Amino acid sequence: MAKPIADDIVVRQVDVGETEQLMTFLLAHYYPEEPLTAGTHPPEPEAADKEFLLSNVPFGTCFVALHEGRIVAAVVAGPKDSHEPEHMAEEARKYAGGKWGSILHLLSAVETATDVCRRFSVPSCLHVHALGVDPQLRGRNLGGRLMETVAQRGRDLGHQLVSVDCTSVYAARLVQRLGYQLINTLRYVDHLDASGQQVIRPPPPHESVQTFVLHL
Ligand SMILES: CC(C)(COP(=O)(O)OP(=O)(O)OC[C@H]1O[C@@H](n2cnc3c(N)ncnc32)[C@H](O)[C@@H]1OP(=O)(O)O)[C@@H](O)C(=O)NCCC(=O)NCCS
Numbered sequence: 001m002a003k004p005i006a007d008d009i010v011v012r013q014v015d016v017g018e019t020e021q022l023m024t025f026l027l028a029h030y031y032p033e034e035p036l037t038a039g040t041h042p043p044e045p046e047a048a049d050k051e052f053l054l055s056n057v058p059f060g061t062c063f064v065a066l067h068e069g070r071i072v073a074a075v076v077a078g079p080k081d082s083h084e085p086e087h088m089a090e091e092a093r094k095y096a097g098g099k100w101g102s103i104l105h106l107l108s109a110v111e112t113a114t115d116v117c118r119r120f121s122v123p124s125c126l127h128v129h130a131l132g133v134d135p136q137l138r139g140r141n142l143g144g145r146l147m148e149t150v151a152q153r154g155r156d157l158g159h160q161l162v163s164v165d166c167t168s169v170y171a172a173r174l175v176q177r178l179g180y181q182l183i184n185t186l187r188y189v190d191h192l193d194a195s196g197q198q199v200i201r202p203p204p205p206h207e208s209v210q211t212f213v214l215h216l
């Protein structure tokens with residue numbers, strides 16, 4: 001289970017029992033700059049946030065790029081069906097009040113608005129939950145290579161659609177280059193909590209979460 005790319009970079013599937021290295025990479029080079037995480041407080045993700053990402057590892061849909069045994073890029077993906085809008089709404093309620101609750105309330109608003117299984121009459125979708133590249137390796141299409149790996153895994157699994165919430169404009173530009181289509185835009189200034197406070201305040205240039213899909 002190894003796909004050589006680039007120079008000394010190999011793409012591998014994250015194995016159940018190797019999640020610590022993946023989380024260490026995510027905490028170093030994904031979470032500090034990911035707009036929802038950077039736009040909420042404290043800077044570090046809560047346990048439930050990290051645990052949800054790692055809950056996708058058993059699906060075989062999580063991949064890393066390795067260089068000298070070190071993870072330099074990672075993608076986390078998992079399945080969803082037409083019940084996901086209801087499921088995410090309930091999960092947002094469960095964790096309301098914390099950093100993860102704020103992030104989930106935005107992600108759940110987006111899932112309700114996109115509702116891709118009903119929108120495209122497909123039974124399921126492979127959703128990309130996280131994508132990050134070491135800053136020293138950015139601009140070498142490692143993100144695109146990992147997204148292509150996910151698409152092929154989706155094809156093998158019978159999914160007819162891949163979806164991804166590009167909270168970052170760099171990810172939006174990447175998936176545009178891959179031929180994904182935009183299906184939803186939610187501006188961060190437009191998303192409040194029940195008390196009227198803006199939930200996510202991310203650094204510019206990230207002004208919106210843009211959801212893209214790819215038909216398989
Ligand atoms: C999103 C991400 C994986 C894209 O990285 P990537 O695949 O290497 O990006 P690309 O190969 O498409 O690079 C295209 C150009 O955009 C720039 N670019 C990519 N990400 C950038 C970033 N955070 N900041 C500034 N410029 C960036 C590249 O450096 C490159 O330009 P250059 O070669 O002239 O310098 C990366 O930005 C990242 O890890 N961000 C932090 C976590 C995050 O926000 N993930 C996505 C949430 S949707």
Ligand SMILES: CC(=O)NCCCCNC(=N)N
Nearest residue numbers: 036037128129130131165167
């Ligand atoms: C592909 C991608 O990275 N999308 C952004 C997801 C939002 C952040 N998720 C968590 N903080 N758990």
